[PDB]
Amino acid sequence: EVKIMVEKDPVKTSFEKWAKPGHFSRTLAKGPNTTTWIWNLHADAHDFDSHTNDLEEISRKVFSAHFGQLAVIFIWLSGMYFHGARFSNYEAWLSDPTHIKPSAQVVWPIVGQKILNGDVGGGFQGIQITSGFFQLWRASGITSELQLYTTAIGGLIFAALMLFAGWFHYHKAAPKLAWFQNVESMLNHHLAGLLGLGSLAWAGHQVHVSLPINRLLDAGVDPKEIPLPHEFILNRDLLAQLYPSFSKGLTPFFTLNWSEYSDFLTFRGGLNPVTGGLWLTDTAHHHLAIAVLFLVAGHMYRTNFGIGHSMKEILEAHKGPFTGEGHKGLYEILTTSWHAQLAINLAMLGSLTIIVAHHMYAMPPYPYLATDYATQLSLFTHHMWIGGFLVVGAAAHAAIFMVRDYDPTTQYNNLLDRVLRHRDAIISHLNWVCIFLGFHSFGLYIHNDTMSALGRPQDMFSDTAIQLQPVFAQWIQNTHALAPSLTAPNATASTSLTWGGGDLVAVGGKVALLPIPLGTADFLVHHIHAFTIHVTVLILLKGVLFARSSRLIPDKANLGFRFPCDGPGRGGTCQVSAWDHVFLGLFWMYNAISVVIFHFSWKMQSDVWGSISDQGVVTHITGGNFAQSSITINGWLRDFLWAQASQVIQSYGSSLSAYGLLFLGAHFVWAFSLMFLFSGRGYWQELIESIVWAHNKLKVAPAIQPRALSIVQGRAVGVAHYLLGGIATTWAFFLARIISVG
Amino acid sequence: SISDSQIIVALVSAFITGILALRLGKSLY
Amino acid sequence: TPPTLNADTPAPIFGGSTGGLLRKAQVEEFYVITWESPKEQIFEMPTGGAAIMRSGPNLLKLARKEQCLALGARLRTKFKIQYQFYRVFPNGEVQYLHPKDGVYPEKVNAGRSPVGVNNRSIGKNANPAELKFAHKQAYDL
Amino acid sequence: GPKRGSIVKVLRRESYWFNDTGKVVAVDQAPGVRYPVVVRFDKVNYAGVSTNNYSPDELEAA
Amino acid sequence: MQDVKTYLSTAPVLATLWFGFLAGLLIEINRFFPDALVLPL
Amino acid sequence: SVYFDLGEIDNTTGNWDLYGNDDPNRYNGFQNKFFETFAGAFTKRGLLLKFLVLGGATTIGYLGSTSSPDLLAIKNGPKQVPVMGPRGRK
Amino acid sequence: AHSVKIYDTCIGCTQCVRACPTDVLEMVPWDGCKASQIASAPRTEDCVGCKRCESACPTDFLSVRVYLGAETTRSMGLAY
Amino acid sequence: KYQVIEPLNGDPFIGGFETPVTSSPLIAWYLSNLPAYRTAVAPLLRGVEIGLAHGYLLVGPFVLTGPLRNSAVRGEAGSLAAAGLVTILTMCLTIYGIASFKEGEPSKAPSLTLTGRQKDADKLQTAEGWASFTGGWFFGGLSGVAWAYILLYVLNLPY
Amino acid sequence: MTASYLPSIFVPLIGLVFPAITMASLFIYIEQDE
Ligand code: CLA
Ligand code: CLA
Ligand code: CLA
Ligand code: CLA
């Protein structure tokens, strides 16, 4: 049944298809009559399922493209490591991580840009990075530039390797469709092999090299006197000097008496009191448990060895009264369509990125991470944006599947059919709840603004006037604050310091974390978050459901997934496809994520961070003005935008000048997007004729006739420039603020 | 209009002008 | 040709939907489409979802005309099935529309009159500045 | 009308190829055809087509 | 080898080669003749 | 088994009344008589719209004019000294 | 209620009537182009303004022209 | 209990479903026994009942959260605001009745039951029917606001 | 201000009553088929 399947040498490697630019699609392989050929070439350059029709070639192309992407990622990683090795103040940072700003990039002195190499400390001059790579290397046990150089080379090797594979499995030994379809063995190997063995190997590295080196770094010894990471491998006695449990050998693990490993396999909440990060003796135990979890979970599905589940008997068995014929006919969907898999994978990966961004700020896993505010803010914002993009991509690919892979002749299996058969109800109720949330979230802010404007603050929705204390979040905080005493007797402390329990921790001045309060100003913004998320789901789900047909256009699936409009008739049918719904949902995703990152920035600078002095007095950065000034839009205008934007604007003539330049650059790009977002193709196509006339008058008429951008490319360009401008503006503002004041 | 009757004069004159505008609008329609 | 007459043929099997008729169908026109099939297949409904048509005669009532034409084109192209559809008023006055003379509007046919045909090239119409204070537009001439 | 393979320049005021040249393909010699001349151009229009038919009195420059 | 030359004769490759050569030229000139505001000729 | 007909056209267009209580009387006859003799003259819509507009006009008039000093803030006027002009104005 | 027009340049491609999703355009005998065919719009009372007709005629400029006029229920494409 | 979802009246070609929410014995009974759906009763009585209920419920969100919710005139201002809202709604109902109903049309209401019984349409969808409904609603709303104020800010039994 | 009781008479009669009656009149004129 399950076996290796390969077709020897299916495509001769050559340069013939390389000289003919358009070769994948026959419609544009002929040549560029007009200039709307250069555009759609790059447009459908990666539309593998559009060039051909057989799943086999599509799957082979997908495989090789994955290999190329992995090679590019490996080149990126090797470059980051080589820069940390050659142009970084890492060794100087290790001797004083609380007074040396990280930096791993230097600039050539050519045109006066030399001043971008600011004084970061340690006798170095370069741009201050915020990737958090220094903390990651300190937590990994890396303690010398040499140990970076090597791994850089290592990465490069893998890069080449990946490229080789990418060529091989398309040109010498490419599989056939029947091989990719074995999803049972694929999941078996990704659970047991990739995640399980990977976690086990990292737990091994931790428990062997990362624990003793980091412990000796916490004891205050010089990073040069620390023995090399192999002196703890060929000397169990030198390692047992810190964790004497190693003196007991590998015997406790095999006699099930491994409760004596409590030295390096701990269960302790809170953060390390000197590094402001998690206990590596805890993360080692965590990885050791996760590894065996994924390993025993990688034996569920059936292969050619008789035992195991089959993910078709599992599906059909779930078929209730309310839901027609259950999950029947879904195993046929997710093994004969690459899009219905990409949708689920993108949705789950985006949600997981959001979970990661929420967890890492609250439980700092790297030493001296919660101290460096710039890194902790960038790692939140970047990951939030990535997740917000991935979820919209999931929506788009679900729409694509519904448009050109769905068919009813087999989808009489009343689960997808049933949800398709009450879309007019799903979207109606989602619309109503969106309206309700929008009103009961934004009208409260408008109320507060009008009251504070009418000289009557006593009628506001503040924490002094009518209160809206979120009781459920407070109860959850109080419940997790008491867990290490009742509902977690073995855990020494709560999982995080953000819960109301616990106390403050300092890393030499600046504060790392403390219990976070929750008042009305948090109630309002959480409801605003819910409202924006709901509107985004509304747009995307409406597009996905009405991707096939609607009352307006009953044969929309014949038109396709991507098309501008079905005429100016029926009153007007502009922006009626699913691609246009993704276009419209990108802006609301941008809105939502921008509000989230503003929330996080202000709340952290106001109620979390700061610099404590002796006797315990702690003064936050802004001064705790979030609970009172964030209830009115004017407060977000002056106390957040106007006030905090005072660092970037006056950064000229300093090491933070590039942020001040990119502020205005991103403003220009954002405003430039409006030219494409507001205008239309006809005006520009007409205007181009009056320029072609002047060209013909002087015999400079090009042979590739200059047509204007299509109605869909205009929208694509507009949304791309809009997102670039907005995100780059927020990037520059956030960095120029937090680098100087954090 | 620091006086009192002058406000009443203004009001009644505005009312006459309103009736005139009403007749004009009716004629325009 | 004598237009075909409606009957009480059965309807395709369908579990329901929220994209069916509305109040427009009881205070104004509504449409109904019929066809003949040799077996029992699964066809996609122009209102969302799938339905199994029955052998022999079938009759389906919809809410617009474009829905009927879409479904009929899909039939004629994928299943090779010929069809007709009517329009029914509130007072039960059936009107026969699509195969008005039996032959579909693509193939030529005798006994057909030309409507809206102008005996000139499109770029010859007079300007809209001579026919002012005269409701002839530019092209009805 | 004109000869085959002859290069003629258009005069149709509402033509994409107005004041442009093209070589005749084959003029139909039926009795009642209103636009018999068929000319193909080396540059497509906004719709993408390059062949079009005109009447003999609507295009001639040689 | 002929198709390699044809590929190197493409628009993006010639564009990037030309713009990179021009960037190198201008960068060298500015590294040797910096802060040029008025032509001393 | 058939879902179309020209005779019973209302069966094949969805004109049913899904919730119809045909009960001709639900309340006490005395209470109904005492409710229709008092809320009966209010039936004349021509003589009710012109009644409502005048009632509301006179109501917001009397309440707008015969207000209280403590209730309203625009009626209590200023009870302090005015701030001065930033350029020495008043 | 929109006004469709068919000028005397139709070469009888029959694509206009194939594309119109309302059964508005139909073929008609008319000698003069090649095959004695021409288009005809008798049912203009059903055109919504789809302009699928104009997007199909491979004539110099066009031979079938739709002019958007008074709006009704049929032309608005409403189903409610 | 086998399959609880059904098309409307067993007809698949109508826009809806007979889910447990719309069609159900308890739900159909509760919805039929509401004054707006009781067909044969005179419109004036239904209007009176509905106005009573609405005017009685409306005094709450006006007295507890107003601009004078912290004064000795606490309840009176809210009751006056409720009366203003009910007279405004009466005016809207009146103009709706004028614009939507003619004095010659028999009835726009449905005539059949769920099983096609030839019953009689609701007299509420007549012009005079809607006029009586509006008058009864005006009276009921005023009386309900007055009774709510009487029970709250004249007598005992706080809440 | 001489009167000082007129602003309490007019803006309630021009921001509340005037729109309330003109919108009703215009709605009756719009939604009628004559
Ligand atoms: C050893 C050299 C070599 C040669 C001569 C060929 C030759 C060929 N390959 Mg092939 N291939 C190779 C290596 C090679 N390949 C490797 C290493 C991989 C793994 C990634 C692939 C994967 C691959 C696939 C999946 C496909 C081909 C196809 C083809 C054929 C057409 C290619 C074409 O015209 O597109 C030329 C394309 C380019 C020049 C684009 C190169 C862009 C690279 C791959 C990515 C660079 C990204 C870079 C980081 C830039 C990022 C953005 C930047 C601007 C910042 C042709 C026979 C296609 C085919 O036969 O289908 C009919 C096809 O579908 N190849
Ligand atoms: C796992 C990730 C993933 C994968 C594999 C794909 C794969 C695909 N997508 Mg997809 N997509 C994704 C994520 C992904 N997408 C996400 C996250 C979104 C939400 C934004 C979308 C939204 C989307 C749409 C709306 C469409 C696709 C389409 C496609 C298909 C053709 C893509 C193509 O030819 O692009 C070619 C690539 C380009 C033309 C590059 C464009 C340049 C980008 C827009 C700008 C990049 C900016 C850069 C970061 C910095 C700018 C500055 C610098 C340039 C100077 C292909 C199957 C298309 C389709 O028809 O599917 C069949 C289509 O219409 N996708
Ligand atoms: C600031 C600009 C702005 C505003 C206010 C809105 C508002 C709205 N958009 Mg939106 N939109 C915008 C820009 C904006 N959009 C842009 C730029 C785009 C392009 C990407 C979109 C794309 C877009 C899509 C694709 C969708 C929306 C939707 C919505 C609605 C969501 C429902 C809701 O929350 O109602 C709450 C409404 C408000 C908070 C508005 C303020 C109301 C005030 C507070 C009340 C005033 C009191 C009283 C009525 C005033 C009387 C005045 C009188 C006395 C004279 C809402 C009406 C969605 C929708 O239709 O869902 C229903 C939807 O699907 N929009
Ligand atoms: C166009 C001219 C104009 C404008 C904009 C205003 C504006 C205002 N007047 Mg006013 N007023 C005007 C002329 C005007 N007045 C004249 C000519 C008189 C003498 C009769 C008065 C006598 C007057 C009094 C006695 C009072 C006001 C008050 C007010 C304020 C509240 C509104 C109100 O109650 O109006 C009420 C308006 C009237 C009773 C008479 C209207 C005057 C003319 C006939 C209206 C002009 C018609 C206009 C051009 C058409 C508009 C068309 C438009 C809808 C498209 C407001 C600032 C009140 C105030 O001070 O509050 C603080 C107040 O008590 N006005």
Residue numbers in the entry:
A (entry chain A): 9 to 750
B (entry chain M): 3 to 31
C (entry chain D): 77 to 217
D (entry chain E): 72 to 133
E (entry chain J): 1 to 41
F (entry chain H): 51 to 140
G (entry chain C): 2 to 81
H (entry chain L): 63 to 221
Sentences from the paper on this structure:
Among them, PSI uses the peripheral antennas to absorb light and transfer the excitation energy to the PSI core complex consisting of core antennas and the reaction center P700, thereby driving charge separation and transmembrane electron transfer. In contrast, PSI cores from eukaryotic algae and higher plants exist as a monomer, which is associated with various membrane-spanning light-harvesting complex I (LHCI), forming PSI–LHCI supercomplexes. Bryophytes (liverworts, mosses, and hornworts) are derived from the ancestor of early land plants, and are the first group of plants that shifted from aquatic to terrestrial environments. In this study, we purified the PSI–LHCI supercomplex from the moss P. patens, and solved its structure at an overall resolution of 3.23 Å using single-particle cryo-electron microscopy (cryo-EM).
The overall structure of the Pp PSI–LHCI is similar to that of land plants reported previously, with a core complex composed of ten transmembrane subunits (PsaA, PsaB, PsaF, PsaG, PsaH, PsaI, PsaJ, PsaK, PsaL, and PsaM) and three extrinsic subunits (PsaC, PsaD, and PsaE) on the stromal side, and peripheral LHCI composed of four Lhca subunits surrounding the core at the PsaG–PsaF–PsaJ–PsaK side. The structure reveals the association of four Lhcas to the PSI core, which is similar to that in higher plant PSI–LHCI, but with Lhca5 replacing Lhca4, and sheds light on the mechanisms of light-energy harvesting and transfer in the PSI–LHCI from bryophytes. In addition to the protein subunits, we found 156 Chl molecules (144 Chls a; 12 Chls b), 34 carotenoid (Car) molecules (26 β-carotenes (BCRs); 4 violaxanthins, 4 luteins (LUTs)), and 10 lipids (6 phosphatidyl-glycerol, 1 digalactosyl diacylglycerol, and 3 monogalactosyl-diglyceride), in the Pp PSI–LHCI supercomplex. A Chl molecule (Chl a305) was found to bind to PsaF in the gap region between PsaF, Lhca5, and Lhca2 in the Pp PSI core. This Chl was not found in any other PSI structures reported so far. By contrast, in P. patens, Chl 305/PsaF provides a bridge to connect Chls of both Lhca5 and Lhca2 with the core complex, facilitating EET from Lhca5 and Lhca2 to the core directly. However, the corresponding residue is changed to Gly170 in Lhca5 of P. paten, which is not able to coordinate a Chl, and this further decreased the ability of binding an additional Car. Without the two connecting pigments, the interaction between Lhca1 and Lhca5 in P. paten is much weakened, and the EET pathways within the Pp PSI–LHCI supercomplex can be changed significantly when compared with the land plant P. sativum. Superposition of Pp PSI–LHCI and Ps PSI–LHCI based on PsaA and PsaB, the two biggest subunits of the PSI core complex, shows a shift in their LHCI belts, with Pp LHCI moving away from the core. Similarly, a shift of Pp LHCI relative to the inner LHCI belt of green algae was revealed, when Pp PSI–LHCI was compared to the green algal PSI–LHCI.
